[PDB]
Amino acid sequence: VIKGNEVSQIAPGQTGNIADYNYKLPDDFTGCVIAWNSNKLDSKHSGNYD
Amino acid sequence: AWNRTRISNCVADYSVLYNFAPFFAFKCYGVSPTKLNDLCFTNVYADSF
């Protein structure tokens, strides 16, 4: 579960907040990264602070 | 009207640019980041756009 300007760091050999603190992808990654928006199911009016 | 800022006789305290000045777009071309601790810069210039 990420933000909007967050899919960019999800790639092999990538660095950033995710790769330094949250999650590290192997450079030899053999798989598919799939993403879709989740406004109607992962958001709250005051902020889905969960 | 960019300024060619010249830096000399200091240290490469670059980790602050990640969080102390939390700028998001950080693409290092030619020299990938996180290795910037020795043999790093000789005639470092900075361009402000």
Curated annotation (Swiss-Prot), chain A:
Effect seen on changing K44T:
In strain: Omicron/BQ.1.1
From the UniProt entry, list the residue stretches annotated as the region Integrin-binding motif.
3-5
Q: Subunit comment for this entry?
A: Binds to host ACE2. RBD also interacts with the N-linked glycan on 'Asn-90' of ACE2. Cleavage of S generates a polybasic C-terminal sequence on S1 that binds to host Neuropilin-1 (NRP1) and Neuropilin-2 (NRP2) receptors. Interacts with host integrin alpha-5/beta-1 (ITGA5:ITGB1) and with ACE2 in complex with integrin alpha-5/beta-1 (ITGA5:ITGB1). May interact via cytoplasmic c-terminus with M protein. May interact (via N-terminus) with host bilirubin and biliverdin, thereby preventing antibody binding to the SARS-CoV-2 spike NTD via an allosteric mechanism.
Q: What does this protein do?
A: Attaches the virion to the cell membrane by interacting with host receptor, initiating the infection. The major receptor is host ACE2. When S2/S2' has been cleaved, binding to the receptor triggers direct fusion at the cell membrane. When S2/S2' has not been cleaved, binding to the receptor results in internalization of the virus by endocytosis using host TFRC and GRM2 and leading to fusion of the virion membrane with the host endosomal membrane. Alternatively, may use NRP1/NRP2 and integrin as entry receptors.
Q: What is this protein called?
A: Spike protein S1
